[PDB]
Amino acid sequence: VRYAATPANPAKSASARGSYLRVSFKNTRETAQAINGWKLEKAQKYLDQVLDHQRAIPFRRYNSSIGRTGQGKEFGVTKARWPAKSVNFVKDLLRNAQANAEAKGLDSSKLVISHIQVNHAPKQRRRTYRAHGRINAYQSTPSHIELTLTEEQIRLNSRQRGRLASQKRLTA
Amino acid sequence: SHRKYEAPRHGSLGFLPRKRAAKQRGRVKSFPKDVKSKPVALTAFLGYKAGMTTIVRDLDRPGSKMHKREVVEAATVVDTPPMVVVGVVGYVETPRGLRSLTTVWAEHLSEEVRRRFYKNWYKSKKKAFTKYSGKYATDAKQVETELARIKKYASVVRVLAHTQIKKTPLSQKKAHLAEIQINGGSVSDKVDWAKEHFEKEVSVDSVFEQDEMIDVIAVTKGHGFEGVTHRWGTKKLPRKTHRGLRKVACIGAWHPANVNWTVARAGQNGYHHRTSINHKVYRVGKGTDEANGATEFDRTKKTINPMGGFVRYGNVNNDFVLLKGSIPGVKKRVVTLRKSLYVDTSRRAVEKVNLKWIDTASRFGKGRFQTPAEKHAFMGTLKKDL
Amino acid sequence: ANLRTQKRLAASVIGVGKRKVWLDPNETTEIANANSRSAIRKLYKNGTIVKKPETVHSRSRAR
Amino acid sequence: LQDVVTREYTINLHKRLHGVNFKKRAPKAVKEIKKFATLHMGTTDVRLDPKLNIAIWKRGVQGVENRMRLRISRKRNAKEKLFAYVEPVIVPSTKGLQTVVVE
RNA sequence: UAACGAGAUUCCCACUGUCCCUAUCUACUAUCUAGCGAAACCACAGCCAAGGGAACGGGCUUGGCAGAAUCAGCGGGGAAAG
RNA sequence: UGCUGUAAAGCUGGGUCGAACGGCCUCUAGUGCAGAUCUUGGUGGUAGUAGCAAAUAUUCAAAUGAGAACUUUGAAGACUGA
RNA sequence: GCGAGAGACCGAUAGCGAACAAGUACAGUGAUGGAAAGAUGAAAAGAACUUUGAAAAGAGAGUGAAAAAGUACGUGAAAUUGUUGAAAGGGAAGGGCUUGAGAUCAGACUUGGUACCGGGCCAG
Ligand SMILES: [Mg+2]
Ligand SMILES: [Mg+2]
Ligand SMILES: [Mg+2]
Ligand SMILES: [Mg+2]
Ligand SMILES: [Mg+2]
Ligand SMILES: [Mg+2]
Ligand SMILES: [Mg+2]
Ligand SMILES: [Mg+2]
Ligand SMILES: [Mg+2]
Ligand SMILES: [Mg+2]
Ligand SMILES: [Mg+2]
Ligand SMILES: [Mg+2]
Ligand SMILES: [Mg+2]
Ligand SMILES: [Mg+2]
Ligand SMILES: [Mg+2]
Ligand SMILES: [Mg+2]
Ligand SMILES: [Mg+2]
Ligand SMILES: [Mg+2]
Ligand SMILES: [Mg+2]
Ligand SMILES: [Mg+2]
Ligand SMILES: [Mg+2]
Ligand SMILES: [Mg+2]
Ligand SMILES: [Mg+2]
Ligand SMILES: [Mg+2]
Ligand SMILES: [Mg+2]
Ligand SMILES: [Mg+2]
Ligand SMILES: [Mg+2]
Ligand SMILES: [Mg+2]
Ligand SMILES: [Mg+2]
Ligand SMILES: [Mg+2]
Ligand SMILES: [Mg+2]
Ligand SMILES: [Mg+2]
Ligand SMILES: [Mg+2]
Ligand SMILES: [Mg+2]
Ligand SMILES: [Mg+2]
Ligand SMILES: [Mg+2]
């Protein structure tokens, strides 16, 4: 399998994947962007506080007509949520990549979430029933998630040279 | 087409936007115009709305059918412990308006006013005004220099005063700090008065006399989001109207193809800043007086407090102001009492009030006694009395 | 862990409704092993399964 | 500080149930009692004795008593080092009773 | 034309929030959260005033102006959708 | 990556890929798409939005389980009310 | 119908409706109506084993010419989308012309001839 981003030094990196996960893509994109570039331990503590509603995930792109909260002030937003299913899937993938780094001999206190991204997975179809005998779509929008933990002359003209030389001769 | 019939507009366009006040403390938009020949005096005071009561009064209004006859009147009690003067600000006249030049503070500020400058006082090192307090080191020439600057350049001098909210039954510990303009005398006179009043208490009886007409600055009672029917007093639609009736049926003509600012719309009601004028002072009571609620006709030794205390306020153990009628705000609200901005010589403004009696029955129910002694005299011994 | 069958069998063996069958909460393993009506009869006789008393409708006020 | 402790409290369930949906008054008395034990014992792990559940529900979904006398024990436990155990105290009247440490 | 009538109509008594003139209260919503998650519709899009113009402009011309990201409501406009 | 042609287009560098394909002289046609409320397939914005509100009502504990508002058992509170 | 040979025919939305368990699945009381759906690799060699995880899976490893072929299989366009990087942004954006800035590309010291002859481009 090919990751979207290859690590610069593969010997100091560990990766994890989750494909066809039946979790909301939009929520999972927001929770991945909330911990992109963080220390692994800091992000793990943060995701625990999100599950405990002590802190929130800022919703930045897929946030139309969602509620406002005071727990978004930390990130300079008003729209934030606490997506538990997405947080749990991301925590599972962080746990897996940390196990892979330990199996590589890397140090967990130095690990940083250097790469994480969410792609659309193929939809899962269902049916909903509508007024006047109509059928509509009731699809799921699943997620692919992947992540990587990384341990932390001048050439002058003839007259430009002439001016430079004559200026040196003025200064003795 | 024109309206079939004429009717006045619902509500006033002079109180827009109907939004929440930016602060809970009402701010004096305008102070009384300064007259140099008068003595140096404060123009406003801060108090707390305790509650309402009832009085009986002999009317002095010749030509009225109630002249020399008893009237029963609603009154408002404002708990007003003395304010402490802690600072002074100088203002300069500029082609762009008044501009604060300098603020000089007193050496010592009490904890209740220093809590004003904190959102998290309990987690703080409480460093406010410590270096400034050091500015008074053994000569205070920085302070004298700033005071001389105010004397030399300021045209409007305002004092900084805070309430002693620890003397009220409120659980809030932050004092309320406000600028009160000093009127009367020269600028130098005003600066000398402020300096000599640094860290001193100023009472209500030095700002307001009885029978005065004063204005009240306060933020009214909040009601949250409200529909047009009660926000603007519009007519309810018929009972059989689809999708509801507490609406305005037509919110505009086809053109202008926009909703106009003059149409009543649902939104936040109450909690507005209001300036209410011409409230007569029926009493400037004293906290040390044990007969606050007693008059010359009711000699019952009696405080202003009703039986069981003011509901959701407590007892008024301080100096107080008894105002005629109703003032904006709720109980416990900080209220700004301002002197009148004009000279009223009407009989309502110049009438001398002599109270007959002040109601001190319980406000927590249909109270029927003015005093526990009266209650015991009426009912006799109870089982709990043994 | 799922005594639904045992309660249905006990109701049929005792002859009462399922609402009157008491399965000993401290004997879950033994009841879970009672796969037959014979074993249900044995537990009923031992007191592991109890027929609960009828809820009283007194006729005293009517009388 | 002693981590293992038993005390008897009176809880005013009447003001905590003021205005509450009638079909939610006993469930909310359960939640108010849990929040009461967290307030006093400092533990978010609160366990209710089934005899306490019977006393709460004794008069139906809206028959919760005005005052209940509770015995609350902090005991060693997990993700929570301690827990609070609430069980009822049978008393003649629930009035005039102060908080008491049970030794 | 007695009787009958969820037939049409007028008057009277009783009655009342139909109204004067509104106010208050309950449950379920709406609201906020976890999970789940459609559809209509969609040239491009979306601030006004006047002008001219297929004679009623979001776009053109001339002006007024104009500061991220937004939430609950709302029914003026989109000569809104079907 | 560029070059050529007014243009329709032709050629070329790099990457990907894996079995056929082109220039020129002619022949032939089911031979060139932006539209047809076109056809079939696929995908958006809307949008984490509308919403998931009839039928009185659930609660405590134990068991099981990686995981229990929803499973099982016990205790209670209710309802259908022949 | 049975058996054969062919073509300037079509090349999986084409060619019969049907290249496949197609007159099938499925609908309709019924007469009838009636699809979609081909392609790993030469060969399953279809990933032993270790490790994290409740598991699905992941990470190592292994097979293979290739896993940028893993059965959700040749190639793998566009719409639409994530991440990284670059840039711009006061009630749309997009376009033409012109120049600046930044990036990319190109070219005469030529297939130059013998210190010199002479040449190329930009300018006075
Ligand atoms: Mg919202
Ligand atoms: Mg439906
Ligand atoms: Mg139907
Ligand atoms: Mg008119
Ligand atoms: Mg209201
Ligand atoms: Mg109707
Ligand atoms: Mg009262
Ligand atoms: Mg209520
Ligand atoms: Mg009939
Ligand atoms: Mg149009
Ligand atoms: Mg216009
Ligand atoms: Mg015109
Ligand atoms: Mg238009
Ligand atoms: Mg313009
Ligand atoms: Mg509406
Ligand atoms: Mg409209
Ligand atoms: Mg091949
Ligand atoms: Mg050829
Ligand atoms: Mg054709
Ligand atoms: Mg097309
Ligand atoms: Mg065309
Ligand atoms: Mg079309
Ligand atoms: Mg289509
Ligand atoms: Mg919603
Ligand atoms: Mg509904
Ligand atoms: Mg019943
Ligand atoms: Mg075909
Ligand atoms: Mg076909
Ligand atoms: Mg294929
Ligand atoms: Mg290959
Ligand atoms: Mg391949
Ligand atoms: Mg492929
Ligand atoms: Mg694309
Ligand atoms: Mg804007
Ligand atoms: Mg350019
Ligand atoms: Mg350039």
From Swiss-Prot, chain B:
Q: Please indicate if the UniProt record lists Ribonucleoprotein as a keyword.
A: yes
Q: Which InterPro entries match?
A: L3_arc_euk, Ribosomal_L3_dom_3_arc_sf, Ribosomal_uL3, Ribosomal_uL3_CS, Transl_B-barrel_sf
Instruction: Could you list this entry's UniProt keywords, alphabetically sorted.
Output: Cytoplasm, Ribonucleoprotein, Ribosomal protein
PROSITE patterns associated with the record: RIBOSOMAL_L3
Any GO CC annotation of this UniProt entry: cytosolic large ribosomal subunit
Q: Which GO terms describe its biological process?
A: maintenance of translational fidelity; ribosomal large subunit assembly; rRNA processing; translation; translational elongation
State the family named in the UniProt similarity comment for this chain: Belongs to the universal ribosomal protein uL3 family.
Please describe what this protein does.
Component of the ribosome, a large ribonucleoprotein complex responsible for the synthesis of proteins in the cell. The small ribosomal subunit (SSU) binds messenger RNAs (mRNAs) and translates the encoded message by selecting cognate aminoacyl-transfer RNA (tRNA) molecules. The large subunit (LSU) contains the ribosomal catalytic site termed the peptidyl transferase center (PTC), which catalyzes the formation of peptide bonds, thereby polymerizing the amino acids delivered by tRNAs into a polypeptide chain.
This chain belongs to the protein called Large ribosomal subunit protein uL3
Q: Which organism is it from?
A: Candida albicans (strain SC5314 / ATCC MYA-2876)
Q: What does UniProt list as this organism's lineage?
A: Eukaryota, Fungi, Dikarya, Ascomycota, Saccharomycotina
Curated annotation (Swiss-Prot), chain C:
Q: Where in the cell is it found?
A: Cytoplasm
Q: Which domain of life is it from?
A: Eukaryota
Q: Which family does it belong to?
A: Belongs to the eukaryotic ribosomal protein eL19 family.
Q: What does this protein do?
A: Component of the ribosome, a large ribonucleoprotein complex responsible for the synthesis of proteins in the cell. The small ribosomal subunit (SSU) binds messenger RNAs (mRNAs) and translates the encoded message by selecting cognate aminoacyl-transfer RNA (tRNA) molecules. The large subunit (LSU) contains the ribosomal catalytic site termed the peptidyl transferase center (PTC), which catalyzes the formation of peptide bonds, thereby polymerizing the amino acids delivered by tRNAs into a polypeptide chain.
Under the subunit heading, UniProt states: Component of the large ribosomal subunit. Mature ribosomes consist of a small (40S) and a large (60S) subunit. The 40S subunit contains about 32 different proteins and 1 molecule of RNA (18S). The 60S subunit contains 45 different proteins and 3 molecules of RNA (25S, 5.8S and 5S).
Q: What is this protein called?
A: Large ribosomal subunit protein eL19
Q: Which organism is it from?
A: Candida albicans (strain SC5314 / ATCC MYA-2876) (Yeast)
Organism taxonomic ancestry: Eukaryota, Fungi, Dikarya, Ascomycota, Saccharomycotina
Gene encoding the protein: RPL19A
